[PDB]
Symmetry: C3
Subunit: 327 residues, 3 copies
């Protein structure tokens, strides 16, 4: 169990990539305070089973075992658990039907966009949409996993912030001179939080090429995933940022990036995101308190006109009833 | 703090070989930091006290042994073998106050091991019959620091069904994983398991007179092997493992025996370090423990600890 | 924060002025508060000591840059003037920052080459040091010593004199001269005072006074040379301290490194003991309870003064 809210437990979250889960493999992960085991059978096109990493016999992690004959086997006594989590065999008592109590705690898992989505509760919410996934004109790439020692909601608040661009992202996403921020259009509606189109000022790098005027916008249907859309000179680049809430104070950041330009741009896209993500991590790791402060009437946070979309985020979290990872 | 039932039992804290004349050693029992010291005389007794000087809270272990006294390093106070301050160097003519006294504990050398009771010895040190048999040879395993409850360490050692999966080299085969109807008896002696078969041929039985001490007996084709497993309870979540192995076959087998014991212990320590909760769950976030017929000796250990009133190291 | 106001309303050294050169950003910690110390390229700019905290989104201001007499936060470039008022917000260039856009500032006074800070309202003055003005005395500063021990245990160890023959053998005593004479201890409204006493090696006469719980003035007269010192403890929190010493002497300048070496040896010998002592915090008067003998008169008096002042922070 956990101290997490039901609004959060009943949502889907990315815990891995499908390319990390090979046939016959055992992977560990952490979601909302719970340790997880992700396993597949040696069959090809095998389903991924996401359970709690715990054998109920003597408390040994099931992730220390082996996958054999479509069963996850515990290392201590060799209890064999089927795809539904039911012990189907106890080697010490091979003719005995295992007790019904011998059951692993199983969760909902679904693959989409090459990502493993998990729901610890009742899947009542839907997986965010990524329209360009099935567009053959768009190429796909994934960033590596980033472990961040900061609240899941502080990480998302940062990626909603845009006024920091000319300071901690100078040279990639901002100009320390064009640092004034225009009035921002931010909607709160049925589709979630939308930052409307807005101009990103980037520093010239190629003096031969024309200014890469970038227009960006983003939408949040889920509070820990953000769909971002950028149209520059000759390329539209969309991304799906996904935050794995490890606990109230820890988070994993992953991005699926899709672009309509030359596949040869993959290396540059991945390296440019690395720079921005690590410049953002430096601030996230220093922020206090570690949990995102919600609104109220250490001193309270101060909000200026340019914080419109981040004030609306903190408001959305109070409406959703979020108390985990926030203060 | 620990339950009186544990406070009044004997526990191994060191090997006699390592407490030399004039030496000062350290140990940790039931939450208490301990100082062990000997005088430079031969046949000197071992004094096991709390590692603390009552003047200003400095560890007496950072001091020195001099003239059959332990000297505190801060103000020079000298404590006799009974633990009483006999000289305060700033007041050389003053009879040191009665409060100037170290907290002393009972110490007894048995089986080449230093045994300590922090309470009132109500029970005797566990018996080891082959200690007095000259037909048996003697070897000691090294110390093993385990980040697990002392009671989880003993539960693992009482378990016999794990042999075919984590010990398939020495104590089990994957084609012989079935466990026969085991025999368990909890009497005044303690917890006793009746003899059972172990597949590498071998017959094995064990008895626990005390919760953290195990006597084990194994008969092979040509050799009887016995061991005394001692668990030092550092605190609720930490333990030290030691064994005294005795056998009546060739003394040349000492190295293979120690090598075999090391493999098994480090294979058990891997499961022990992973177990959650860290403290032993007793019979009463994470689901409750499930018990199968092959778990009757470990179910009896948990029942015994509950009956004895153990609340320290257990969940 | 959980500290007693008697402590919050007192002056403490958090740095030496030689460590905060023009245009620098230094960090410190005092009574649980993280502090940012910053200066200007003004050849003689003052030292600002604020809480290491940007009230916009909670970044540490110490990760910023000093520019044109302002401290600039790294996250959104907010510029705070020397009074701590934010005067620029780059996002809204022609917007006067709200009154809330203000760093939490603390009182800072430079004295004896040291940075004194008071987190509250200074009801007391910075401890006195008469040989500072005396031109016949040379001056030197020890390095900062981080001690994993209560500020009050650190000060307890400095007032102890009975331990000189055992852990400071060679500098403040030897094992053949361990008997302690009847010490003169004056506990008054001003504070704790310790009268003249003999330190062996062939001997020197020392005394000390404490007008402040965590500041000690000491005087040693030996063979015509008088050495004085000001021991300052930075209370980091209940369990941690910084130790610093300003030593002044009227002999040869050549003695400086020897003086520094003698202090360094004694201090690290004291730190070996301080780190081993349990409990970490200083036990006051009503693990076994502390026993007191006559050589411990001035250390018993320290505990009695702290209880009368109502110190609960850093004490057991
Ligand atoms: S702990 Fe998993 S089978 Fe015994
Ligand atoms: S601390 Fe042991 S003698 Fe003073
Ligand atoms: S956090 Fe300091 S300026 Fe935004
Ligand atoms: Cl399989
Ligand atoms: Cl025992
Ligand atoms: Cl003073
Ligand atoms: Fe950013
Ligand atoms: Fe084992
Ligand atoms: Fe000293
Ligand atoms: Xe980016
Ligand atoms: Xe063994
Ligand atoms: Xe000194």
């Amino acid at each position: 169990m956990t101290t997490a809210d039901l609004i959060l437990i009943n949502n889907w979250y990315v815990v891995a990539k499908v390319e990390d889960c090979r046939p016959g493999s055992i992977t560990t992960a952490h979601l909302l305070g719970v340790k997880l085991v992700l396993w597949r059978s040696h069959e090809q096109n095998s389903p991924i089973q996401v359970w709690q990493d715990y054998c109920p016999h003597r408390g040994v992690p099931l992730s220390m075992g082996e996958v054999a004959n479509n069963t996850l086997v515990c290392p201590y006594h060799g209890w064999r658990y089927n795809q539904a989590g039911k012990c189907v065999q106890i080697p010490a008592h091979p003719d005995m039907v295992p007790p019904a109590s011998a059951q692993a705690k199983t969760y909902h898992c679904q693959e989409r966009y090459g990502l493993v989505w998990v729901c610890l509760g009742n899947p009542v919410n839907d997986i965010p949409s990524f329209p360009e996934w099935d567009d053959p004109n768009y190429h796909k790439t994934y960033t590596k996993s980033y472990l961040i020692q900061a609240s899941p909601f502080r990480v998302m608040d940062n990626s909603i912030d845009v006024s920091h661009f000319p300071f901690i992202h100078e040279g990639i996403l901002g100009d320390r001179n064009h640092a004034e921020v225009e009035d921002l259009e931010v909607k709160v509606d049925k589709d979630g939080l939308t930052m409307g189109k807005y101009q990103v000022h980037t520093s010239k790098f190629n003096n031969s090429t024309k200014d890469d005027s970038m227009v960006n916008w983003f939408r949040l249907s889920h509070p820990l995933c953000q769909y971002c859309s950028t149209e520059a000179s000759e390329m539209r680049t969309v991304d799906l940022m996904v935050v794995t809430p490890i606990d109230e104070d820890n988070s994993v950041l992953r991005y699926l990036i899709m672009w309509n330009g030359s596949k040869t741009l993959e290396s540059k896209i991945l390296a440019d995101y690395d720079q921005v993500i690590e410049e953002d991590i430096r601030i996230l790791h220093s922020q206090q308190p570690t949990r995102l402060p919600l609104l109220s009437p250490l001193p309270q946070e101060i909000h200026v006109p340019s914080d419109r979309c981040t004030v609306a985020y903190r408001r959305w979290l109070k409406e959703l009833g979020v108390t985990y990872g926030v203060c």
